[PDB]
Every structure is written in structure tokens, then in C-alpha cells.
């Protein structure tokens, strides 16, 4: 079922990629924490979906964001060799549910979902699934509700002590082709007790027929071990954050807890 159809830019992520570091409720407080966060005012790699779906490094954790209207980006593949030799993690959002599996998958040279559209540009139907040819020795399976003006979706992927932890946020965006300037904290989505080695990942697109895609783009950044001062409002929501390693002004604010 594999189709051998073959032939970046950077943006400024001002104050984004911050997530609730734990599950402890806090309010009306400035709290200092140390964890893996996206550095402020960093160079985030910008890809377009003609589509770009290369294999990217995972490093110590991945900040992933997408802007789209037609729901082209459906999921991700995480692993090492990304073939039948090792276990790998497949996260895909289908028409009704999100399917998360860990198996010895044999992925296609260029994996994707094969869909077609109605005469209108809102409805769609599946034709086939062209991501892998096999899925042997499955160890983990989880099914839940889908992860899903353009739609902005942000995810943070961490892998600590065997747990693949996903944080997320979904907001509307009124920009044409870039990330918003402002602050928004990501919330815990799911904790997956998997126990596998991840060094690389790939983005899965829904393509249609040879095969093409509509207008969409996504951004990839990386997390670093940095100190942040998080501002919790009266309702316990983080409304601001200071990157203590950004500049001398932030250092002063973090030192004085203000």
C-alpha cells in the first residue's frame, strides 16, 4: 500500500511552549520551577504542507504546532529506526477517534493517510491507510477521543522514565501564516506508560489524489532545561511566564520573584 511519491524557514516564537509542569493546583502566586521548556524568542523551524514531511530529531523533547483549516495534519510517528526492527509509537487521529499504538511497525518510505473529498470542501471520506505494511509484536494500545479563522494546535512531547507525556492547547488564530504573539499555557492531555526509545519523529498528513494537499503549515521547536517564573492568577491559570535565561532583565525578575 506504500506510494513512492518523492521529489526550511524559521520564525520567532516569542513567549510560547509553556505548560503546567505538574498536577498541583496553585493560585495567586509567582512560582519558580525548573523543567524542559521551549526557550523564549527562539528560532522555530517552519515547514509547509507540494508538502514537506521529513523525519526530524526528537532530542530531549519536541514542541510541535500547526495552523490549518482543513485538518491535513492527522498524527505523528515516534521512534528510532522507524522500521520493523524496533518498537515505535504511532499516534493517528481518524474520523471518530484517536488511535495510539506501540508495535514493530514497518512504515512506508513516505507514510500517509489516503482520503478524498466531497464536491464541497468541508466533507471527506477515507480511501485507504498507507502508513505501514505490518504491525507485529504490539505491546500497547489506547483509544480515546480525537485530539482535535484557522485552527492553531500546540503540543509538547516529552519522554520521561518510559512515560510519553503529551500536553496540548487548541485556540482559533486570525493570522495568515505565522505564530501568535502572546502567552498561553498548555494542559496535560495523556500519560502513556510505553517504555520505548525515541530519537526521531515524522508528521503524518492526509493526502488526496499523484497525491497532494491543501494549504497548511507546522512548526517544530525543541525543549531545554531552563528556569521559569510562572504567574498564576486567582483561578489558578498561568497568565504569564519569565524565561530566567533569556536576558539580564529576566534574571533580575526571577531573582527577586517579581
Amino acid at each position: 500500500q506504500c506510494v513512492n511519491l518523492t521529489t526550511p524557514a524559521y520564525t520567532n516564537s516569542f513567549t510560547r511552549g509553556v505548560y503546567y509542569p505538574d498536577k498541583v493546583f496553585r493560585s495567586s502566586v509567582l512560582h519558580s520551577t525548573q523543567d524542559l521548556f521551549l526557550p523564549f524568542f527562539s528560532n522555530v523551524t517552519w515547514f509547509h504542507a507540494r508538502f514537506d514531511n521529513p523525519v526530524l530529531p526528537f532530542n530531549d523533547g519536541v514542541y510541535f504546532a500547526s495552523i490549518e483549516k482543513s485538518n491535513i495534519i492527522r498524527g505523528w510517528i515516534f521512534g528510532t529506526t522507524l522500521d520493523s526492527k524496533t518498537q515505535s509509537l504511532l499516534i493517528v487521529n481518524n474520523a471518530t477517534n484517536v488511535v495510539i499504538k506501540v508495535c514493530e511497525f514497518q512504515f512506508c518510505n513516505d507514510p500517509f493517510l489516503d482520503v478524498y473529498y466531497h464536491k464541497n470542501n468541508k466533507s471527506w471520506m477515507k480511501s485507504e491507510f498507507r502508513v505501514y505494511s505490518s504491525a507485529n509484536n504490539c505491546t500497547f494500545e489506547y483509544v480515546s477521543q480525537p485530539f482535535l479563522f484557522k485552527n492553531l494546535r500546540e503540543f509538547v512531547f516529552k519522554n520521561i522514565d518510559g512515560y510519553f507525556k503529551i500536553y496540548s492547547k487548541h485556540t482559533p488564530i486570525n493570522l495568515v501564516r505565522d505564530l501568535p504573539q502572546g502567552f498561553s499555557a498548555l494542559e496535560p492531555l495523556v500519560d502513556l506508560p510505553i517504555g520505548i526509545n525515541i530519537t526521531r519523529f515524522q508528521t503524518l498528513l492526509a493526502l488526496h489524489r499523484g497525491w497532494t494537499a491543501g494549504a497548511a503549515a507546522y512548526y517544530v521547536g525543541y525543549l531545554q532545561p531552563r528556569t521559569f517564573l510562572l504567574k498564576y492568577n486567582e483561578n489558578g491559570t498561568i497568565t504569564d511566564a519569565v524565561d530566567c535565561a533569556l536576558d539580564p532583565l529576566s534574571e533580575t525578575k526571577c531573582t527577586l520573584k517579581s
Partner: antibody, heavy 125, light 105 residues
């Protein structure tokens, strides 16, 4: 394979309520993308669509008959039940249930691939 | 319901091509489908989404949909193709079947 089986009363009186049950196999009513519709065909006449139910309990009805039609599904028995009230002699027809192909995103009905055998219901005194 | 019109009947000689039309208001915007019903039997899907066949349907059956008119064509019509043919179209979840065309051979 996929199959559907209609059952229920084959005779009702005027002003009585008819209940028809569609017993299905090969798929579950709780499975995403699944829908089951009801269609009737009076002797010598064309098919008329009545209603269909989606796996997510969303429902579609024919505007001209909506006021007399209720559709529910049994999530344990894999059965779809159609209730049609206040029937008149003119409502005599063969009733069918069938599988519905469904479009996603903006959810729409497409076509009926697998049909049941159908059951004949007469309305008379 | 959705308004949808068919010819009352079509009559061809064996070996000829049968053509059954189906006229609506918005068939150029939505998808049409066709069913074949034999006497005493439930209808069988022959064409869906304008021109796609289900597995098991003979290559004799084809069709199209343009200018708000849909058609079903039977090439090399056989005497075993005698049946009542119906067209269907959905207008934004509003169903509608045509009157049905009796095809004789």
C-alpha cells in the same frame, strides 16, 4: 460479511403505533462511521426514506414524516428500532433497514450498500 | 423530500445500450446513486458517488452526473438486466428517490 434482518408486527390497526426492529450483524452500532436507515416501499410504488441513526446518536428524519417518527438504538444488542405512530391505511408498505455510508467532517449520508430482506406491514381494521 | 424525476420506463433490444436519466435541482452539487430492484427482491446498489461500482457489479453498468442530470448506462444490455432502476440523491441530509424506471429487454 454484513447483514441486516427486519422483524416486528406485520399487521397494525389505524391510529396504532408500529415498532420495527432491525437486527444487524457484521458490524456494531457503536462503531464510528456506522449508520442505519429505514426505507419503506408501498406496493407498486417508489422507495421513500424515513429516517437514519448515526453511531453518535445523531438522527435524520424526513421533514414530511418527522412528526410521527422516532429512532433509537440498543447499544448492547446491536439493534436499531423505528417507532412510527398514528398510522393510516395509506402507510401500508414493505419496510427495509440498510447500512449507510457516511461522510466525515461535515457529517452527511452517502449511499445504502447492504440492504436487509425487508418486512411487509399492513395497516387495516 | 428532495425532488427527483425519472422516466417511467425504458425498452431496448438485447445487445443494445440502455440509458436511464435522473433529473433534480442540485444534482450538479451533490452525489447521485443508483439501485437495481428485481421483482420480489430487495434493491442492490449498482452505482454510488456518481460513477463508482461496488464489488460484484458487472462492468456493463456505468454512469455520470453533470448539469443537474444523472444517468445510468448499461452497455450490452442482457435479458438478465430486466429490473426497476431507482436513483437517489442527498440534498444536505434531505433524502429523495425517483419514481423508478422499468427497464425491459
Amino acid at each position: 460479511q454484513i447483514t441486516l434482518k427486519e422483524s416486528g408486527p406485520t399487521l397494525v390497526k389505524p391510529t396504532q403505533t408500529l415498532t420495527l426492529t432491525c437486527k444487524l450483524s457484521g458490524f456494531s452500532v457503536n462503531t464510528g462511521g456506522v449508520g442505519v436507515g429505514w426505507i419503506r416501499q408501498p406496493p407498486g410504488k417508489a422507495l421513500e426514506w424515513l429516517a437514519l441513526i448515526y453511531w453518535n446518536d445523531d438522527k435524520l428524519y424526513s421533514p414530511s414524516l418527522k412528526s410521527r417518527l422516532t429512532v433509537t438504538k440498543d447499544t448492547s444488542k446491536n439493534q436499531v428500532v423505528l417507532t412510527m405512530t398514528n398510522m393510516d391505511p395509506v402507510d401500508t408498505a414493505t419496510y427495509y433497514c440498510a447500512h449507510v455510508l457516511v461522510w466525515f467532517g461535515e457529517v452527511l449520508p452517502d449511499a445504502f450498500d447492504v440492504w436487509g430482506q425487508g418486512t411487509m406491514v399492513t395497516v387495516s381494521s | 423530500s428532495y425532488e427527483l424525476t425519472q422516466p417511467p420506463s425504458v425498452s431496448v433490444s438485447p445487445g443494445q445500450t440502455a440509458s436511464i436519466t435522473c433529473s433534480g435541482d442540485k444534482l450538479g452539487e451533490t452525489y447521485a446513486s443508483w439501485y437495481q430492484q428485481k421483482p420480489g427482491q430487495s434493491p442492490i446498489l449498482v452505482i454510488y458517488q456518481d460513477n463508482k461500482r461496488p464489488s460484484g457489479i458487472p462492468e456493463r453498468f456505468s454512469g455520470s452526473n453533470s448539469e443537474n442530470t444523472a444517468t445510468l448506462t448499461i452497455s450490452g444490455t442482457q435479458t438478465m438486466d430486466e429490473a426497476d432502476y431507482y436513483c437517489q440523491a442527498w440534498d444536505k441530509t434531505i433524502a429523495g428517490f425517483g419514481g423508478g424506471t422499468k427497464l425491459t429487454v
